[PDB]
Design an enzyme around this catalytic site. Structure first.
Site, PDB file in Angstrom:
ATOM      1  N   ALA A 169       0.790  -1.293   0.068  1.00 46.92           N
ATOM      2  CA  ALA A 169       0.079  -0.031  -0.203  1.00 46.92           C
ATOM      3  C   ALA A 169       0.937   1.235   0.128  1.00 46.92           C
ATOM      4  O   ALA A 169       2.093   1.206   0.589  1.00 46.92           O
ATOM      5  CB  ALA A 169      -1.106   0.088   1.051  1.00 46.92           C
ATOM      6  N   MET A 170       0.513   2.231  -0.609  1.00 50.26           N
ATOM      7  CA  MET A 170       1.173   3.407  -0.850  1.00 50.26           C
ATOM      8  C   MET A 170       0.314   4.628  -0.375  1.00 50.26           C
ATOM      9  O   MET A 170      -0.835   4.780  -0.775  1.00 50.26           O
ATOM     10  CB  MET A 170       1.840   3.588  -2.111  1.00 50.26           C
ATOM     11  N   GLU A 171       0.865   5.790   0.017  1.00 45.98           N
ATOM     12  CA  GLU A 171       0.182   6.976   0.636  1.00 45.98           C
ATOM     13  C   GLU A 171       0.024   8.003  -0.312  1.00 45.98           C
ATOM     14  O   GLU A 171      -0.180   9.221   0.250  1.00 45.98           O
ATOM     15  CB  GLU A 171       0.743   7.436   1.890  1.00 45.98           C
ATOM     16  N   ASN A 172       0.338   8.045  -1.696  1.00 46.23           N
ATOM     17  CA  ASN A 172       0.250   9.065  -2.683  1.00 46.23           C
ATOM     18  C   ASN A 172      -0.967   9.795  -2.494  1.00 46.23           C
ATOM     19  O   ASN A 172      -2.227   9.475  -2.250  1.00 46.23           O
ATOM     20  CB  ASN A 172       0.003   8.208  -3.894  1.00 46.23           C
ATOM     21  N   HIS A 225      -4.875   3.155   7.318  1.00 46.99           N
ATOM     22  CA  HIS A 225      -3.497   3.566   7.416  1.00 46.99           C
ATOM     23  C   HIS A 225      -3.141   4.427   6.554  1.00 46.99           C
ATOM     24  O   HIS A 225      -2.518   5.503   6.706  1.00 46.99           O
ATOM     25  CB  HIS A 225      -2.688   2.290   7.343  1.00 46.99           C
ATOM     26  N   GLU A 226      -3.411   4.249   5.217  1.00 45.69           N
ATOM     27  CA  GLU A 226      -3.029   5.316   4.078  1.00 45.69           C
ATOM     28  C   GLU A 226      -3.773   6.254   4.122  1.00 45.69           C
ATOM     29  O   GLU A 226      -3.049   7.348   3.716  1.00 45.69           O
ATOM     30  CB  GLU A 226      -3.338   4.409   2.706  1.00 45.69           C
ATOM     31  N   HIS A 267      -2.074   9.085   6.196  1.00 44.34           N
ATOM     32  CA  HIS A 267      -1.130   9.762   5.923  1.00 44.34           C
ATOM     33  C   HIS A 267      -1.580  10.985   5.097  1.00 44.34           C
ATOM     34  O   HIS A 267      -0.675  12.016   4.750  1.00 44.34           O
ATOM     35  CB  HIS A 267      -0.371   8.904   5.066  1.00 44.34           C
TER      36      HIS A 267
HETATM   37  C1  LIG Z   1       0.411  -1.943   7.606  1.00 43.98           C
HETATM   38  C2  LIG Z   1      -0.961  -1.716   6.816  1.00 43.98           C
HETATM   39  C3  LIG Z   1      -2.246  -1.641   7.483  1.00 43.98           C
HETATM   40  C4  LIG Z   1      -0.293  -0.730   5.460  1.00 43.98           C
HETATM   41  C5  LIG Z   1       0.873  -1.114   5.106  1.00 43.98           C
HETATM   42  N1  LIG Z   1       1.214   0.089   3.962  1.00 43.98           N
HETATM   43  C6  LIG Z   1       1.926   1.091   4.771  1.00 43.98           C
HETATM   44  O1  LIG Z   1       2.480   1.288   5.772  1.00 43.98           O
HETATM   45  C7  LIG Z   1       2.175   2.245   3.579  1.00 43.98           C
HETATM   46  O2  LIG Z   1       1.480   3.447   4.048  1.00 43.98           O
HETATM   47  C8  LIG Z   1       3.679   2.707   3.177  1.00 43.98           C
HETATM   48  N2  LIG Z   1       3.565   3.505   2.157  1.00 43.98           N
HETATM   49  C9  LIG Z   1       3.950   1.140   2.376  1.00 43.98           C
HETATM   50  C10 LIG Z   1       5.375   1.408   1.988  1.00 43.98           C
HETATM   51  C11 LIG Z   1       6.459   1.749   3.103  1.00 43.98           C
HETATM   52  C12 LIG Z   1       7.859   2.058   2.405  1.00 43.98           C
HETATM   53  C13 LIG Z   1       8.243   1.758   1.168  1.00 43.98           C
HETATM   54  C14 LIG Z   1       7.234   1.415   0.116  1.00 43.98           C
HETATM   55  C15 LIG Z   1       5.883   1.253   0.611  1.00 43.98           C
HETATM   56  C16 LIG Z   1       0.867  -2.303   4.240  1.00 43.98           C
HETATM   57  O3  LIG Z   1       1.010  -3.502   4.855  1.00 43.98           O
HETATM   58  O4  LIG Z   1       0.670  -1.965   3.019  1.00 43.98           O
HETATM   59 ZN   LIG Z   2       2.453   4.103   6.078  1.00 46.98          ZN
END
Ligand SMILES: CC(C)C[C@H](NC(=O)[C@@H](O)[C@H](N)Cc1ccccc1)C(=O)O
Ligand SMILES: [Zn+2]
Ligand SMILES: *[C@@H]1O[C@H](CO)[C@@H](O[C@@H]2O[C@H](CO)[C@@H](O[C@@H]3O[C@H](CO[C@H]4O[C@H](CO)[C@@H](O)[C@H](O)[C@@H]4O)[C@@H](O)[C@H](O[C@H]4O[C@H](CO)[C@@H](O)[C@H](O)[C@@H]4O)[C@@H]3O)[C@H](O)[C@H]2NC(C)=O)[C@H](O)[C@H]1NC(C)=O
Ligand SMILES: *C1O[C@H](CO)[C@@H](O)[C@H](O)[C@H]1NC(C)=O
Ligand SMILES: *[C@@H]1O[C@H](CO)[C@@H](O)[C@H](O)[C@H]1NC(C)=O
Length: 818
Positions: free
Chosen positions: A270-273, A305-306, A309
């Site tokens: 997942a990504m916070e774009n 979570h996203e 952000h």
């Molecule tokens: C813990 C889950 C609920 C959410 C988690 N996703 C995140 O934490 C995202 O916000 C992050 N942006 C995922 C990420 C971190 C570092 C480099 C690339 C991608 C995921 O597991 O995808």
């Molecule tokens: Zn995150």
């Protein structure tokens, strides 16, 4: 001769606004770009260093104005992923210039940067999409830029595409312009000030479903056209959660819209774009044939979570990657604060503290990321419970409002909250120091003594924390605070108490130990009136007791007398603590001669859970944790020949054999039922046949378990050889069977005697095989069992520990049981 020798970019040339034109071909898999950056120089200079990676710079020039342009010499330093643009004359300080760069490149085939991804329609045809993933350092792959999170700017993004596709990005689409025959140029609105890694654009053929929030923010879910009907849940979850955050942060969602896109082959996941978050399809899409009950819960938290952000991390982003843990820590912590309110039915609470316990167990080692982000959340929770929830809320609001569209350091969050108690100095003890403290409580009349010490599995550290202690009392009705800044401190009660308990709610990132016999009164408290404290309070007790037992500060019987209260427990959290610390014990006895203690122990465990096991419905109803407990309780009961469950189980398995495997069987119970069924030599075989038409399901893995659970040693040994053969199954499963049999009380000798024999031809198929070497010797406790075993350097240790534990506790457990 590259004019720059630092990984970090020069700080005297500053971007203001990017104008991005990207033209990608989803057929030839290549893309051309013309990006223009408006910059300002704070110091005179004729070189411009910025980021580029795997981009072929056709052309670069410098514009000012009334218009003037001039070519820039272009030097690359691939190691540093940097370029240098050489100008004829130096730049005039304060004067706005513009750099125009033409470049070309090939869509990433590595799921990072501007990358290609595929999918197949139900008709079976293969489609291509282009997508972005920039965190932390990939923007430089899609277009040249100052790719550090502190260099924020505005972005005018233009995507050229075929008419059969659609582009989405951070901001709303302003206009589409037919630019040539089969070409359309999509113009999206200018972004607000943001970092490069948060920029995003997707080119594909997705469908969308859209809802409008109460504040008029349009929320949409994009997905593959065949699956778009599975977005209904995520979309609703997104809408209500967005509304939640807007209230909590008391700051309106910064952007016009929010687009959640389910991406094929996404690997983040997942990504916070900003304004366009991305997910792995399983984290967003939901089928009435769900991967599990956990999926609904899974996607409700990945979203939360996203979405968090959007404010914390995007509106106020870190200055540098060293603070990434706070960004991620807070989003994790916020997963709960939000959902607990938004979707209470999911019972997110349980899974939180689980990760806190998980974090702690790892911090308790000599050596001390997702877990480090778990500590961050745990720390935050601790702080939030010390200061009121509201003091915490407002402190955060102030942080966001004061730093909106800018960058930040750890101290900035602390400073912001400390201005509503020296939060900063306190929090740094937890942030700049690995580990957490053991807290010992000594009472002498009204005199309550606290003491701290770095808790670790030789022992000699000077670590020292500012710990926000909390405690309740047999007399008090309210929760008390005390800030422990030193090695020891005292505290005077108004009167003598019958029991005192620290770390109320289990909200603090520390374990507490009671001197003298505070445990006695606590276990006396729990056996009399266990509701006198919260469910999680009871869980923290069980958890701390059995940990203190394993480090020699508590006697095994004190912690066992404690568990005796569990006969009356009804809440998941504690019971799992009980099971997690009790089971492993008899799994060490199983692999030992003495059968009498083993049997009395198991007998004791089933007498403890007896009542609870009976209350279990044999259905698939309830929340994820409720279903996990049902599953584990029943399996346990039947594995230990608790007749009531074993009988019932037999029945179900019979109805399902004569079915045949036709009538549906609740997944919660199938694990137990199959286990029981595999005990008969005919039922074992039936399962083995049904084992092929298992549909690569969850059901297969359930059988795989039941088969390894039989007491037929020949049928076990048989599974061993055959899963080594090519014909019936080979590399994909053997490693997991071996360990499964290595845990059968009557099958462990075979897996061990097997790892030895076939060792030579075995190693023939060294990083994932360590699992097999652990799962085969992990639970030996004999000195002689060691003389035998004499990467997997850990497995040698863990046994050493198993022996100590046995040489100390066995005699106590034996006497206890009688
Ligand atoms: C813990 C889950 C609920 C959410 C988690 N996703 C995140 O934490 C995202 O916000 C992050 N942006 C995922 C990420 C971190 C570092 C480099 C690339 C991608 C995921 O597991 O995808
Ligand atoms: Zn995150
Ligand atoms: C990514 O890159 C590809 C090429 O790799 C671009 O695809 C070309 O797009 C143009 C514009 O869409 C297509 O042009 C069409 O050619 C037709 C004739 O066919 C020629 O090409 C085909 C396919 O190879 C051959 O079989 C055939 O023998 C010919 O050699 C024309 O009839 C079309 O006419 C169009 O222009 C006229 C004049 O203005 C109009 O009157 C018509 O209405 C129509 O608009 C057209 O010119 C070209 O065929 C495509 N290539 C291929 C290999 O098919 C993609 O556009 C590009 N896409 C993206 C998103 O970047
Ligand atoms: C047996 O049950 C399955 C569903 O589990 C069903 O699809 C199938 O048609 C049934 N066979 C019959 C009704 O003959
Ligand atoms: C893309 O890859 C091909 C080789 O597959 C290469 O020849 C071509 O130059 C590349 N395009 C670039 C680097 O812009």
């Amino acid at each position: 001769p590259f004019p720059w020798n630092k990984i970090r970019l020069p700080e005297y040339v500053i971007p203001v606004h990017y104008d991005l034109l990207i033209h990608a071909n989803l057929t030839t898999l290549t893309f051309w770009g013309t990006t223009k950056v408006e910059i300002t120089a704070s110091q005179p200079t004729s070189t411009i260093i910025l980021h580029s990676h795997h981009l072929q710079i056709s052309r670069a020039t410098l514009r000012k104005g009334r218009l003037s342009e001039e070519p820039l010499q272009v030097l690359e330093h691939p190691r540093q992923e940097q370029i240098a643009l050489l100008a004829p004359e130096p730049l005039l300080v304060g004067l706005p210039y513009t750099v125009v760069i033409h470049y070309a490149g090939n869509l990433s085939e590595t799921f990072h940067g501007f990358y290609k991804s595929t999918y197949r329609t139900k008709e079976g045809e293969l489609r291509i999409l282009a997508s972005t993933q920039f965190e932390p350092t990939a923007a430089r792959m899609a277009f040249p830029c100052f790719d550090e999170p502190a260099f924020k700017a505005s972005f005018s993004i233009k995507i050229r595409r075929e008419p059969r596709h659609l582009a989405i990005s951070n901001m709303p689409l302003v206009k589409s312009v037919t630019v040539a025959e089969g070409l359309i140029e999509d113009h999206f609105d200018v972004t607000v000030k943001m970092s490069t890694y948060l920029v995003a654009f997707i080119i594909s053929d997705f469908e969308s479903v859209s809802k409008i929030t109460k504040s008029g923010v349009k929320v949409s879910v994009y997905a593959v056209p065949d699956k778009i009907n599975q977005a209904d849940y995520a979309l609703d979850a997104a809408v209500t959660l967005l509304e939640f955050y807007e209230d909590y942060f008391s700051i309106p969602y910064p952007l016009p819209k929010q687009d959640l896109a389910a991406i094929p082959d996404f690997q983040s996941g997942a990504m916070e774009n900003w304004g366009l978050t991305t997910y792995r399809e399983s984290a967003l899409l939901f089928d009435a044939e769900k991967s599990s009950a956990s999926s609904k819960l899974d996607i409700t938290m990945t979203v939360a979570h996203e979405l968090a952000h959007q404010w914390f991390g995007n509106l106020v982003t870190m200055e540098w990657w060293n603070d990434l843990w706070l960004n991620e820590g807070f989003a994790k912590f916020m997963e709960f604060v939000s959902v607990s309110v938004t979707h209470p039915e999911l019972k997110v609470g349980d899974y939180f503290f689980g990760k806190c316990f998980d974090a702690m167990e790892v911090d308790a080692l000599n050596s001390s990321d997702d877990v480090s982000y778990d500590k961050g959340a745990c720390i935050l929770n601790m702080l939030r419970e010390y200061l009121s929830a509201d003091a915490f809320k407002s402190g955060i609001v102030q942080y966001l409002q004061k730093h909106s569209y800018k960058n930040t350091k750890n101290e900035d969050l602390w400073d912001s909250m400390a201005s509503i108690v020296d939060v900063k100095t306190m929090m740094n003890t937890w942030t700049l120091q690995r580990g957490f403290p053991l807290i010992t409580i000594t009472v002498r009349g009204r005199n309550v003594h606290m003491k701290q010490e770095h808790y670790m599995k030789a022992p000699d550290t000077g670590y020292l924390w500012h710990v926000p202690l909390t405690f309740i009392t047999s007399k008090s009705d309210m929760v008390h605070r005390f800030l422990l800044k030193t090695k020891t401190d005292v505290l005077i009660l108004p009167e003598e108490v019958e029991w005192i308990k620290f770390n109320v709610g289990m909200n603090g990132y520390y374990i507490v130990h009671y001197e003298d016999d505070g445990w006695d009164s606590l276990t006396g408290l729990l056996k009399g009136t266990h509701t006198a404290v919260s469910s999680n309070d009871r869980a923290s007790l069980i958890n701390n007791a059995f940990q203190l037992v394993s480090i020699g500060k508590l006697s095994i019987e004190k912690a066992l007398d404690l568990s005796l209260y569990l006969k009356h427990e009804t809440e998941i959290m504690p019971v799992f603590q009980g099971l997690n610390e009790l089971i492993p014990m008899y799994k060490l006895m199983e692999k030992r001669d003495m059968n009498e203690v083993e049997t009395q122990f198991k007998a004791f465990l089933i007498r403890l859970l007896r009542d609870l096991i009976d209350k279990q419905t044999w259905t698939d109803e309830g929340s994820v944790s409720e279903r996990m407990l049902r599953s584990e309780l029943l399996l346990l009961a039947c594995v230990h020949n608790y007749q009531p469950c074993v009988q019932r189980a037999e029945g179900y398995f019979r109805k399902w054999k004569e079915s045949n495997g036709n009538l549906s069987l609740p997944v919660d119970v199938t694990l137990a039922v199959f286990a029981v069924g595999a005990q008969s030599t005919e039922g074992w075989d039936f399962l083995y046949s049904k084992y092929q038409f298992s549909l690569s399901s969850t059901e297969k893995s359930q059988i795989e378990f039941a088969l390894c659970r039989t007491q037929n040693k020949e049928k076990l040994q048989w599974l061993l050889d055959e899963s080594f053969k090519g014909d019936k199954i080979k590399t994909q499963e053997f490693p997991q069977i071996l360990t499964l049999i290595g845990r059968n009380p009557v099958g462990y000798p075979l897996a061990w005697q097997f790892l030895r024999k076939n060792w030579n031809k075995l190693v023939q198929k060294s990083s994932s095989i360590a699992h097999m070497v652990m799962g085969t010797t992990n639970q030996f406790s004999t000195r002689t069992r060691l003389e035998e075993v004499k990467c997997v350097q850990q497995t040698i240790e863990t046994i050493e520990e198993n022996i100590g534990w046995m040489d100390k506790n066995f005699d106590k457990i034996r006497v206890w049981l009688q």
